[PDB]
C-alpha cells in the first residue's frame, strides 16, 4: 500500500542497465525497477537523466561524419 | 535534318498504303490462336521473357478480336512437351478463355513443338463448324524446328483441301517449313509468314491480326444467314437460365422459343438460332465501307485555308501538314488525320458537305 | 569570381559556396562541365552531350570525388595533372578543352593551379647500365639544380638504389619528377626475353586503353594501373611482358598468387616452363637461361630471420640480374616498412603497379609516386559493372537486433573480448541459419567471413559444415576448398581473412557477414570484390547477394558504415534490414531456447 | 480540412448569425462553393421552385451505395443551420435557408446582387506589371520573414502581433526573433490557399467586436472578387480590415481605387516536373526545380552545394536531418515534403517493385514505405532513431485491486481525454495533470 511520486519511463533492459549505469556514477536518483520496459525515477531530474542518455548513445556512435 | 528523313520515312511507309481495296473480308470468323509452351519461350531474352509476353500479348488480342468482330468464336490449344494441350473450346465468352489464359501464366512453360500433332488437332476442333465461317489459325512459334510423328504434307493437303488458312508469326527467324505452310496455305502468299523486330514490332503484328482477312472469289461461299434478334427483359424475380441453369433477375428472351440466355450475342441452346444486336453487325462497316487517305497539301501552293477544318486548330508551318480529305475537299492536321482514319469511321467534313 | 558577387540572404551556410556568380553560358544545354572553385570540385552532366570524349579527359587530368548515375563530382588535382603530362598534356590543352566543353568561366585559381601542375617532362630521367641506377638528364641544367639540392651526394650519374627512393620522393617535392619510360627496343644492355604475343590472347578495349597511355611512345611509361576486381590484370601484365621482350619479374603477396599467376603466365604467354623458375620454400630453382623469369612472393626477399642457402643463392641470383620490367601486383602492401626494399633489392626498368583498391588507411599509397610513378590508367567500376566486366551486386546491409541475453555481459565485458562477446549473439545465429536454408533454397553458393578464429569455428561446427582460416594449413584448407566446390555435401564454407583477398573465388554469388575488421575499408572492399569477379555477371537478370549480419545497440553500426562508405560512394550501395524474412518459418533455430543461448553465452564467458 | 474547419467554424457561428451570413448572394456563392456535390445538387435543384420536400422523396432518390456521404452532406447541411428540418405531418420536412435560396437565386439569374459581388469601378488596368508585381513582392518578403532568412521589409505591426500571440513562427520575446514552430513548419508544408485560410481563420478567431460578420461577407466577397480592376472603397471596418490586407500586399490599393492582384484568386480557388526531386541513396539532391526561396527553406533541413537554372544539387547530411528535429519539426512533416516532392523515374520503379512484391507474398516481410526504402527509410530508420522513447512525467496511480475499477478509472479518464499511458498487465495508467482532480472526484464517487 504505497503510492510514491515518480515518473514512469517505457524502457528495454539494454537501455535500463544504462540507466543502472546512470545510478552507479551518480545514485539514488532512478526510484526502483518495475519490469523490463518500465521504472520509475525522480521527478527533478527526469531531463538531466534524458540529457545524459543522450550522452550515453553519443558514446554509442555520435555520427560526427567529420 | 530529322524532319526529311521522317518524311522519305512517311513516304516509303504510304507507298504500301497506296492501294486501298474494298476486298470482300470475312465476317463469320474462326480464329485459333495455338500456343507453343516450350524451352525456348524459356529464355529471358527478351523482357521479362517469351513466355510472359506472349500471355499478355494474347490477353489483348483476345480483347482486341471480341471487340472489333464479337461474331466468331476462339478456342486455344497449347502446345507442351510433345503434346498439343487444348485448354479453350471455341465459345462466345472472351472471359473463359481468358480464365484459362490465367491459368497458363502460373504454369511453367517447358518441351518441345509438333506442329503436326497440333495443327491435327486444331483441324479436328475445326471440323465442325459451318460454312460460312472462315477457319483460319494464328499461330505463335519459337523453335526453328519440329519433333514431329509423322508426315506434315499429308496434313498440309488435307487443310488446304477443307479450306482452312493459317498466318504464322515466328519469334527467331524464317523456318522454311513454316514459309512453305504459308505460302501452300494461302494461294503463295508470302504476306502470312512474319518475324516480329522487336516487342513493338510484336504488338504490331497483333494489333494487324486481328483485323478481318479479305476473301478470294474462287472461294465463293455466297448465301445467306437466318438470324434473330431477341428481346431483354427485367423482370423482379430471379429466373433459371438455359445455358448455365441458375436463378437470373434479368437476362433476354429467345425470339422464337421464348427461353432465356445469359449473355450476347450468342446463339440460342433452345431452339439453336443466332442471336445478336443491330449495334454487332454494325460493328464492322468501317471493313465494310473503308475511308480514303487524306493527303497533305504541298507548301508551295496556295492553301484554301491556314488552320485545321475539324479539331480547329492553326496549322503549323517549312512544310504544310493538311492532310486533305479528296471526297470533302476540306484539309485537316495530323491529329484529326489520325483520329478520323483510325478512332472515328466518318469524315465530318463529308458529314456537312450534302451529296 | 567573375561577378560582383553581393552576398545572398541565402547564402550564409554557403561559405563561398553560392556559385550563381559565374555567367553561365547559354550553351549550358550542350557542355557538360561545371567548376567548383572553393574546393576544386568538378560537377559533371551524364546527360548532356560531350560528355563521352571528357570522360577520358577528366579521367586523366581530374579525380572523381563521387559518381553517381546522374552527376559525377569530380576534382582536379596536381597528382592527376601530373598523371595528365605524364600520359603527355599539358597547361594549355586543358584550359582550352576545358573552356572549350566548360559550361562556366573557367576560375582564375584552376587556371593558376594547372599552370603551376606542370612538370619539366623530358627533363629528368633515369637509367640502369648494369644494375647501375644511372641518372641520365637531357641537361647540366638539371644537373646544377640537383647538386645545388643538398640531398644528392645526357650526362648521368649514380645514385644509390635506397637514396634513389629518397631522391625520387625529394625531385617530386621540389616538383622535379623523373619520368621512367623504358627503350627496351633501343636498349641491348638487358637480355631480350623472346615472348610472343600469341593470337589466343585479345584485349580488351579498357584494356588497350591502359597499355596505349603507357605505350603512346613505344616506351614503358612506369607507374600505377588500377583496375577492377577480374578485369584482367594479369592480361593486361602478360602483354605489357610479351611487347617488352625482356627480363621480367612480378611479386605478388601470397605464395598461392605465386602459383597461380606463375600458371597464367605460362598459359598466355609463350614464356616456357624452364625460364619460369618459382622460388618458395616448396622449392628453389633457378633457370638457367639467358632470359626468362623468377617468381616469389615478396616474403622470400623481405625476410631475414629463417634463410636457407639456397634462398641466398636465389636472391643473390636476382640481384645479380637486371630485369627490364618489375609488377608489384596488389601494390596496397608493398609500401609498407619492410616490404619497401624493392628498389634496393632489385634492378628492374619500368614499374609498374596493378591493383584494385588504391586506398589504405595511411599515406602510404602516394608513395608509389616516388616508388613506382602516378596511375597509368584506371577503369570506371559502374561502367564496367554496366559492361558486365564486373558484376551487380543486390548487397542487403542486415541489421540484427541486439539480444538483451548478449548486451547484459557485453556492457561489463572489458573492451578486449567486448568484441568477442557481441559477434556471437544467438539471435545473430538463428538469422544465418534461416539466411543459409533460404539460399540453399535458392541455391546459391555461400560464403561466410569472420575476423574471429572462434566465432568462424563456432558457426561452422553449428552448420555441420567445415572452416578456414588464416592458421589453417594449405593443405587442409585446398581439401575444404575442393570439397566446397565438387562435393555437394559441403555446400557452404567458413571463410576470413585468407578468403577477404588474393584469392580466385567466384562461384560465391552469395556471401554472408558475420564479423570484419574494426575500420578497415580495404577488407571489405576485397570481400566485395570476391563476389564481384563472379562468372554470372553478364547473364540477364542477374543480381549478386551480399549480407552483413551487424549486432545493434553497439559501435559496430558506425563501423559497418566506415567499412562501407568507400563502396556507398563508389556506387555499390548498403540497403537497411532490420525485420529479417522467414524469421520462425523456419522450425529449429540456433541457440533458439533462451537455455541455449545462456549455454553460448557461458561456453564464451569460459574465454571472455 | 479547410472545408472542415470553415464549416466547423460556422457551425461553431450560431443559427441567426450563419442566417446573416446566407443573406448576401456572393457569400452564398461562396459557401455553395463550398458544399459537397450532393448538396450542391440539392440546393441547385430545390432553389428553383419554392416546394418544400420531405426526407423520404429524398431517400427514395438517393441510391443507397453512397448512403454514408449523403448522411455527410445532410449533417454538414443540417448543422450549418441551412436546412430547416421539422417533422411536420410526422415526416421531417425538408427545408432551405430562404435568405441563402433566394441569394443563390439571385446570383444565378444575375438579380439582385446589391454589389456584393463587388462595388465595381471597373478602371481595369495590366496586373501582369504592376499587381502581380507587388503582389510577388509583398508575399516574398513575407515569405522569407517567415522563412528566417533575413529581409529587410519586415511585415505589418498588425500580423507580427498575431504571430506573437499565436504559436505560428513564434516571435520568442526572451530571443526577439521569429522562430520556427512545428506549426510554422506546418504553416510552410501547407498550401498557398490553406496558408490564406489559416491566416483569415486565426484573424477571424482573434477580431472580435469590428463587426464578425461584416468581416466575414467581405472575407467572402474578396474571394469572389476579380482581378486587376478598380473599385469603390462599402462598411468603414470592411474599409480598414481592406486596407490591412492591402499591407499584406493582397490588394494594390492607390490609397481610393484598389487592384486585387492574382492572390484573390488563389484565395478563391487553385489556379520531370517542378519541384520533382530525385533521391539517392548518397542522399544527393537532383531537384528539378530553383527558387531563391526553395534555397531558403532547403537550408533548414538540407546541406546544399550551389544554384544553378533548374538543377539545385546538394547532399542530406545528419546534421541538416538533426538540425531539422532539434527545432522541433516533425520527421512527418520532413516526409511531408519527400513524398510531395518525388520524381517520376523513381516512383515508376517503386511501383514496379511493389508491384513484383505482390505476387511474391502479400506481406513481404518489409516495412510499409512506398517510396523507395534505399533512400526513404533511411530517413525513416533515422526518424524512428530520432524520437525512439516514451516520457510520462508528473502524477501516478498505482497498485490497484480489482481489475474492474482499474478498468473504470481508466476507461473514464479516456472517455475525458485526459488519459495519456495505461498497462493492463500491472494494472497502471498514468493521466495529464488538468484531468487529475476530475479522475479523483469519479474515484471517490
Ligand atoms: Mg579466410
Ligand atoms: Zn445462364
Ligand atoms: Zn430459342
Ligand atoms: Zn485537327
Ligand atoms: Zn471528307
Same mark, same amino acid.
Given at each position: 500500500a504505497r503510492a510514491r511520486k515518480g515518473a514512469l519511463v517505457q524502457c528495454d533492459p539494454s537501455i535500463k542497465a544504462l540507466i543502472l549505469q546512470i545510478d552507479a556514477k551518480m545514485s539514488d536518483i532512478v526510484l526502483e525497477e518495475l519490469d523490463d520496459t518500465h521504472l520509475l525515477v525522480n521527478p527533478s531530474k527526469v531531463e538531466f537523466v534524458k540529457h545524459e542518455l543522450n550522452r550515453l548513445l553519443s558514446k554509442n556512435i555520435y555520427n560526427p561524419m567529420d | 535534318a530529322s524532319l526529311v528523313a521522317s518524311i522519305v520515312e512517311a513516304r516509303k511507309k504510304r507507298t504500301a498504303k497506296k492501294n ?264 464492322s462497316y468501317h471493313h465494310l465501307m473503308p475511308l480514303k487517305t487524306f493527303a497533305e497539301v504541298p507548301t508551295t501552293e496556295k492553301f484554301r485555308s491556314e488552320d485545321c477544318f475539324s479539331c480547329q486548330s492553326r496549322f503549323p508551318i517549312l512544310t504544310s501538314s493538311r492532310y486533305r480529305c479528296e471526297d470533302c475537299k476540306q484539309e485537316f492536321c495530323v491529329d484529326c488525320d489520325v483520329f478520323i482514319h483510325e478512332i472515328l469511321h466518318n469524315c465530318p467534313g463529308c458529314e456537312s458537305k450534302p451529296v | 569570381i567573375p561577378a560582383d558577387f553581393v552576398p545572398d540572404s541565402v547564402s550564409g551556410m554557403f561559405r563561398s559556396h553560392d556559385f550563381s556568380y559565374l555567367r ?567 541457440y533458439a531456447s533462451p537455455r541455449e543461448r545462456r549455454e553460448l553465452l557461458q561456453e564464451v564467458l569460459l574465454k571472455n | 480540412s479547410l472545408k472542415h474547419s470553415v464549416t466547423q467554424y460556422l457551425e461553431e457561428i450560431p443559427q441567426q448569425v450563419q442566417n446573416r451570413l446566407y443573406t448576401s448572394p456572393a457569400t452564398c456563392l461562396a459557401i455553395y462553393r463550398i458544399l459537397p456535390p450532393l448538396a450542391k445538387f440539392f440546393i441547385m435543384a430545390m432553389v428553383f421552385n419554392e416546394n418544400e420536400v420531405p426526407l423520404l422523396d429524398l431517400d427514395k432518390w438517393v441510391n443507397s451505395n453512397g448512403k454514408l456521404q449523403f448522411q455527410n452532406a445532410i449533417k454538414s447541411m443540417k448543422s450549418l443551420h441551412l436546412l430547416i428540418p421539422n417533422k411536420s405531418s410526422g415526416t421531417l420536412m425538408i427545408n432551405l435557408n430562404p435568405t441563402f435560396k433566394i441569394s443563390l437565386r439571385n446570383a444565378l439569374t444575375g438579380g439582385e446582387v446589391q454589389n456584393s459581388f463587388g462595388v465595381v469601378v471597373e478602371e481595369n488596368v495590366v496586373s501582369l506589371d504592376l499587381l502581380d508585381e507587388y503582389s510577388a513582392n509583398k508575399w516574398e518578403t513575407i515569405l522569407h520573414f517567415m522563412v528566417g532568412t533575413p529581409l529587410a521589409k519586415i511585415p505589418s505591426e498588425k500580423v507580427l502581433n498575431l504571430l506573437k500571440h499565436s504559436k505560428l513562427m513564434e516571435e520568442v520575446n526572451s530571443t526577439g526573433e521569429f522562430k520556427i514552430t512545428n506549426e510554422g513548419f506546418q504553416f510552410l508544408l501547407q498550401e498557398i490557399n490553406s496558408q490564406l485560410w489559416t491566416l483569415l481563420l486565426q484573424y477571424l478567431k482573434m477580431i472580435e467586436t469590428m463587426d464578425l460578420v461584416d468581416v466575414l461577407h467581405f472575407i467572402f466577397m474578396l474571394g469572389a472578387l476579380e482581378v486587376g480592376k478598380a473599385y469603390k472603397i462599402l462598411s468603414e471596418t470592411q474599409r480598414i480590415m481592406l486596407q490591412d490586407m492591402r499591407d499584406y500586399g493582397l490588394v494594390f490599393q492607390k490609397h481610393s481605387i484598389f487592384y486585387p492582384t492574382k492572390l484573390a484568386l488563389m484565395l478563391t480557388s487553385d489556379t520531370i516536373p517542378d519541384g520533382s526531386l530525385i533521391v539517392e541513396t548518397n542522399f544527393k539532391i537532383y531537384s528539378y526545380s530553383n527558387s531563391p526561396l526553395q534555397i531558403a527553406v532547403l537550408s533548414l533541413f538540407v546541406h546544399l552545394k @550551389? ?5 539545385? !544539387?546538394?547532399?542530406?547530411?545528419? %546534421? ?21 516532392? @518525388? ?5 515508376? !520503379?517503386?511501383?514496379?517493385?511493389? %508491384?513484383?512484391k505482390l505476387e511474391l507474398d502479400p506481406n513481404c516481410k518489409e516495412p510499409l514505405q512506398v517510396l523507395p526504402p534505399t533512400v526513404v527509410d533511411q530517413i525513416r530508420l533515422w526518424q524512428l532513431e530520432l524520437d525512439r522513447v516514451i516520457t510520462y512525467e508528473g502524477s501516478l496511480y498505482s497498485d490497484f485491486e480489482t481489475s474492474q475499477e482499474y478498468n473504470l478509472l481508466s476507461k473514464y479518464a479516456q472517455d475525458i481525454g485526459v488519459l495519456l499511458w495505461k498497462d493492463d498487465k500491472k494494472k497502471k495508467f498514468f493521466i495529464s495533470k488538468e484531468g487529475n482532480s476530475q479522475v479523483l472526484d469519479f474515484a471517490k464517487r
Open positions: - | 486501298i481495296t474494298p476486298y470482300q473480308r470475312g465476317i463469320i470468323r474462326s480464329l485459333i490462336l495455338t500456343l507453343d509452351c516450350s524451352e525456348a519461350m524459356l529464355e529471358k531474352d527478351l523482357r521479362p521473357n517469351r513466355h510472359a509476353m506472349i500471355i499478355q500479348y494474347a490477353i489483348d488480342f483476345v480483347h482486341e478480336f471480341f471487340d472489333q468482330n464479337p461474331i466468331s468464336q476462339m478456342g486455344i490449344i497449347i502446345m507442351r512437351n510433345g503434346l498439343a494441350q487444348l485448354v479453350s473450346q471455341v465459345s462466345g465468352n472472351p472471359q473463359d478463355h481468358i480464365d484459362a489464359l490465367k491459368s497458363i501464366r502460373k504454369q511453367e512453360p517447358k518441351g518441345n513443338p509438333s506442329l503436326q500433332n497440333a495443327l491435327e488437332m486444331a483441324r479436328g476442333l475445326l471440323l465442325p463448324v459451318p460454312a460460312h465461317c472462315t477457319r483460319e489459325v494464328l499461330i505463335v512459334f519459337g523453335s526453328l524446328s519440329t519433333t514431329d510423328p509423322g508426315d506434315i504434307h499429308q496434313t498440309i493437303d488435307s487443310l488446304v483441301s477443307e479450306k482452312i488458312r493459317v498466318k504464322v508469326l515466328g519469334l527467331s527467324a524464317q523456318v522454311a517449313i513454316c514459309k512453305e505452310l504459308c505460302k501452300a496455305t494461302n494461294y503463295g502468299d508470302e504476306s502470312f509468314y512474319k518475324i516480329l523486330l522487336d516487342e513493338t514490332h510484336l504488338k504490331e503484328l497483333f494489333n494487324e491480326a486481328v483485323t478481318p482477312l479479305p476473301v478470294n472469289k474462287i472461294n465463293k461461299g455466297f448465301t445467306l444467314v437466318k438470324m434473330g434478334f431477341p428481346t431483354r427483359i427485367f423482370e423482379d424475380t430471379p429466373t433459371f437460365c438455359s445455358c448455365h441453369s441458375k436463378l437470373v433477375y434479368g437476362g433476354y428472351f429467345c425470339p422464337n422459343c421464348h427461353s432465356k440466355v445469359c449473355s450476347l450475342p450468342t446463339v440460342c441452346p433452345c431452339c439453336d438460332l443466332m442471336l445478336i444486336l443491330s449495334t454487332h453487325l454494325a460493328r | 553561365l553560358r547559354p550553351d549550358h544545354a550542350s557542355r557538360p562541365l561545371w567548376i567548383s572553385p572553393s574546393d576544386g570540385r568538378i560537377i559533371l552532366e551524364s546527360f548532356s552531350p560531350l560528355a563521352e570524349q571528357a570522360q577520358d579527359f577528366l579521367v586523366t587530368i581530374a579525380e572523381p570525388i563521387s559518381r553517381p548515375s546522374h552527376i559525377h563530382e569530380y576534382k582536379i588535382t596536381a597528382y592527376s595533372l601530373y598523371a595528365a603530362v605524364s600520359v603527355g598534356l599539358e597547361t594549355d590543352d586543358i584550359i582550352s578543352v576545358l573552356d572549350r566543353l566548360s559550361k562556366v568561366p573557367v576560375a582564375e585559381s584552376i587556371i593558376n593551379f594547372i599552370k603551376g601542375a606542370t612538370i619539366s617532362y623530358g627533363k629528368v630521367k633515369l637509367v640502369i647500365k648494369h644494375n647501375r641506377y644511372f641518372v641520365e638528364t637531357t641537361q647540366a641544367d638539371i644537373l646544377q639544380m640537383l647538386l645545388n639540392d643538398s640531398v644528392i651526394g645526357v650526362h648521368s650519374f649514380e645514385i644509390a638504389n635506397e637514396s634513389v627512393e629518397v631522391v625520387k620522393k625529394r625531385c617530386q617535392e621540389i616538383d622535379y619528377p623523373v619520368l621512367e619510360e623504358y627503350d627496351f627496343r633501343n636498349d641491348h644492355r638487358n637480355p631480350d626475353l623472346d615472348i610472343d604475343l600469341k593470337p589466343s590472347t585479345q584485349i580488351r578495349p579498357y584494356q588497350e586503353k591502359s597499355l596505349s597511355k603507357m605505350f603512346g611512345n613505344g616506351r614503358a611509361r612506369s607507374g600505377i594501373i588500377v583496375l577492377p576486381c577480374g578485369a584482367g590484370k594479369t592480361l593486361v601484365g602478360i602483354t605489357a611482358a610479351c611487347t617488352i621482350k625482356k627480363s621480367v619479374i612480378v611479386l605478388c603477396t601470397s605464395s598461392v598468387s605465386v602459383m597461380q599467376w606463375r600458371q597464367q603466365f605460362l598459359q598466355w604467354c609463350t614464356l616456357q616452363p624452364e625460364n619460369c623458375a618459382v622460388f618458395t620454400s616448396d622449392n628453389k630453382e633457378m633457370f638457367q637461361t639467358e632470359s626468362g623469369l623468377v617468381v616469389s612472393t615478396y616474403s622470400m626477399v623481405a625476410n631475414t630471420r629463417n634463410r636457407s642457402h639456397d634462398s641466398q643463392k636465389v636472391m643473390d641470383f636476382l640481384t645479380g640480374r637486371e630485369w627490364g620490367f618489375i609488377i608489384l601486383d596488389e601494390v596496397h602492401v608493398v609500401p609498407a616498412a619492410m616490404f619497401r626494399r624493392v628498389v634496393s633489392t632489385i634492378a628492374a626498368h619500368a614499374k609498374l603497379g596493378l591493383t584494385a583498391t588504391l586506398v589504405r588507411e595511411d599515406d602510404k599509397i602516394g608513395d608509389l609516386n616516388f616508388l613506382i610513378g602516378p596511375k597509368l590508367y584506371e577503369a570506371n567500376w559502374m561502367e564496367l559493372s554496366q559492361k558486365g566486366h564486373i558484376a551487380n551486386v543486390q548487397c542487403a546491409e542486415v541489421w540484427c537486433p541486439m539480444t538483451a541475453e548478449f548486451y547484459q555481459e557485453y556492457l561489463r565485458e572489458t573492451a578486449r573480448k567486448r568484441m568477442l562477446l557481441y559477434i556471437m549473439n544467438p539471435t545473430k545465429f538463428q538469422a544465418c541459419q534461416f539466411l543459409i536454408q533460404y539460399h540453399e533454397r535458392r541455391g546459391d553458393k555461400i560464403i561466410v567471413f569472420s575476423d574471429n578464429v572462434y566465432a568462424l569455428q563456432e558457426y561452422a561446427l553449428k552448420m555441420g559444415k567445415p572452416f578456414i582460416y588464416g592458421s589453417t594449413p594449405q593443405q587442409e584448407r585446398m581439401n575444404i576448398l575442393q570439397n566446397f566446390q565438387y562435393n555437394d555435401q559441403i555446400n557452404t564454407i567458413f571463410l576470413s581473412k585468407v578468403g577477404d583477398t588474393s584469392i580466385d573465388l567466384p562461384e560465391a554469388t552469395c556471401l554472408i557477414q558475420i564479423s570484419s575488421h574494426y575500420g578497415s575499408r580495404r577488407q571489405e572492399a576485397q570481400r566485395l570484390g570476391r563476389i564481384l569477379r563472379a562468372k554470372r555477371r553478364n547473364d540477364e537478370g542477374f543480381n549478386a547477394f551480399f549480407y552483413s549480419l551487424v549486432s545493434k545497440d553497439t559501435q559496430e553500426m558506425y563501423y559497418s558504415t566506415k567499412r562501407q562508405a568507400f563502396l556507398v560512394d563508389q556506387g555499390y550501395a548498403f540497403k537497411v534490414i532490420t525485420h529479417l524474412h522467414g524469421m520462425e518459418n523456419i522450425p529449429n533455430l540456433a | @550551389a544554384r544553378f537554372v533548374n538543377m539545385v !544539387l546538394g547532399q542530406i547530411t545528419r %546534421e541538416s536531418i538533426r538540425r531539422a528535429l532539434t527545432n522541433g519539426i516533425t520527421a512527418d512533416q520532413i516526409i511531408a515534403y519527400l513524398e510531395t516532392h @518525388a520524381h517520376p523515374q523513381m516512383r515508376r !520503379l517503386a511501383e514496379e517493385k511493389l %508491384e513484383k
